[PDB]
Ligand binder design. Structure first.
Ligand code: MET
Length: 527
């Protein structure tokens, strides 16, 4: 056992935070929350990528110091994530002095291993992606002016020709070991088609990789190469190292880093159990990073999960915004999170209209979950305001019980893939089954007609709501608490695999107090 270590990418601070960053960090957050619910030690990590030409030039364009610009924008990222109400354990910044030391330490290992030489890069480079590209991965496009230029096929951003004496990492020498790693861990990249992409790309051959740049090109906004002040460390080698840095930082109660340990084993976090990333940055994580780790003799991550990129009303996000805080203030924080995790799987296919948002809010959160919670806690149905003791189970009772008992196992596998969408769907399939059982039994009639039968129906329903809610708690962290409070579930029973079990809450447990205008999810007007 070790600390379950989950990460998000660290984001460029060239501009203000937006939905892409909020989405990636949310996924990271949800994975961490699920493992805490299982009672595991978790360290969840996010942060900002603050060096490089991209960032330094964005600061120049605003006519501000790189130190002042990065600090200000990093501040906006922290404020946004705070407001999004994640449970991230640490926010790292690559300008941190302790991160810097770790980067120099990793570089030195790579050099001492013989995997870094002085050579030349002569080729295309995308500043906006901080990415080296071959002629096969560029094409014709236009400037900011509208003059003809070359652009990345990858991303569409302008590319430039670089010809510089650079320190080069021997990535070509790691091809075989990388292929061995992919084939021996066929779950290590998710989803499967991105795993195939990576293997196909590495099968073709790998060139060596420039890991430094001449200091002027960078506007001196980068980590100097140890032993050679004319060169700065490639922003991506610096950036990827944040995962190692974060694995080695002791953090105090307020979230401040207070100490860098010498050895990752001391904190038991490294290597990451899951790196959450966008598809745009797959090669850095699935090819370069494991190669750096193999060179350094460090263990490799267990999973890399790469999600897709987004649209609002089937259009690129100018004249089309999606501010997550404003949407969350509009429809709800947990509701917005549910929507983002339910609507998209590993694709760009998601309908992010306010229409579809309202349809899921009303249909799934309000009509399926909320209505159910209200039914089984209603004083008109649950006359004694408690968990009743069930009488004998019918076959129908048992079919539903069986679904509830099976759910934790199924949801668990989905959370570990990870495929959060599938986990949510599984839980809601069980919520729908519970609703249909309740409709079929009509407990409102049973109050008058067979109060004994009602004890059974009502107990099964409460327990189905409790289990589904426990498994939804990583997705609806605030609302799950409210639900548990309404059900009167003691704190101890709100986490731990012990409580995945059917029957964990005893009969006789009292419900929470009923507030005057109780409303868990408010249906919105279709507009
Ligand atoms: C080590 S993850 C670095 C990600 C990069 N800063 C980006 O925003 O795409």
């Amino acid at each position: 056992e070790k600390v379950f270590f989950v990460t998000s990418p660290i984001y460029y601070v060239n501009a203000a935070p937006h939905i892409g960053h909020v989405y990636s960090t949310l996924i990271t957050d949800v994975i961490g929350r699920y493992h805490r619910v299982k009672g595991e030690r978790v360290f969840a990590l996010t942060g900002t990528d603050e060096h490089g030409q991209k960032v330094a030039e964005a600061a120049k364009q605003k006519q501000v110091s790189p130190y002042d610009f990065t600090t200000a924008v990093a501040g906006e990222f922290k404020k946004c994530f705070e407001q999004m109400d994640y449970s991230i354990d640490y926010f790292i910044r690559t300008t941190n002095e302790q991160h810097k030391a770790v980067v120099k330490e990793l570089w030195t290992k790579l050099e001492q291993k013989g995997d870094i030489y002085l050579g030349r890069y002569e080729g295309w480079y995308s500043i906006s992606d901080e990415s080296f590209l071959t002629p096969q991965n560029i094409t014709d496009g236009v400037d900011k002016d509208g003059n003809p230029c070359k652009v990345s096929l990858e991303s569409g951003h302008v590319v430039t020709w670089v010809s510089e004496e650079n320190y080069m990492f021997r990535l070509s020498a790691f091809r075989e070991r990388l292929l061995e790693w992919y084939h021996a861990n066929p779950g290590c990249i998710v989803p499967e088609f991105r795993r195939r992409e990576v293997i196909r790309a590495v099968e073709k051959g790998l060139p060596d990789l420039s890991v430094s740049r001449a200091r002027a090109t960078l506007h001196n906004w980068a980590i100097p190469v140890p032993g050679n002040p004319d060169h700065c460390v490639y922003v991506w080698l610096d950036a990827l190292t944040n995962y190692l840095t974060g694995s080695r930082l002791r953090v105090d109660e307020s979230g401040k880093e207070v100490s860098l340990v010498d050895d990752f084993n001391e904190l038991e976090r490294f290597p990451a159990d899951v790196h959450v990333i966008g598809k745009d940055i797959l090669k850095f994580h699935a090819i370069y990073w494991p190669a750096f780790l193999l060179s350094a003799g460090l263990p490799l991550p267990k999973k890399i999960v790469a999600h897709g990129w987004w649209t609002k009303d089937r259009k690129k996000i100018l004249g089309n915004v999606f501010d997550p805080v404003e949407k969350a203030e509009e429809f709800g924080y947990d509701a917005l999170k549910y929507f983002l995790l339910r609507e998209s799987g590993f694709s760009d296919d998601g309908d992010y209209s306010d229409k579809n948002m309202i349809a899921r809010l009303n249909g799934e959160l309000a009509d399926t979950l909320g209505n159910l919670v209200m039914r089984c806690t209603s004083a008109k149905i649950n006359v004694n305001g408690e968990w009743p003791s069930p009488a004998a189970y019918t076959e129908e009772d048992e079919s539903l019980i069986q679904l509830i008992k099976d759910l934790p196992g199924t949801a668990d596998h989905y959370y570990l893939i990870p495929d959060i969408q599938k986990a949510i769907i599984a839980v809601f399939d069980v919520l729908r089954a519970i609703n249909a059982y309740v409709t079929d039994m009509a407990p409102w009639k049973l109050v008058k007609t067979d109060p004994e039968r009602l004890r059974t129906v009502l107990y099964i329903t409460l327990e189905g709501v409790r289990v589904t809610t426990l498994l939804l708690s990583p997705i609806l962290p605030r609302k799950s608490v409210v639900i548990f409070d309404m059900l009167g579930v003691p704190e101890v029973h709100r986490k731990g695999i012990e409580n995945f079990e059917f029957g964990a809450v005893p009969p006789g447990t009292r419900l929470g107090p009923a507030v005057e205008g109780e409303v868990l999810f408010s249906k919105r007007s279709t507009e």
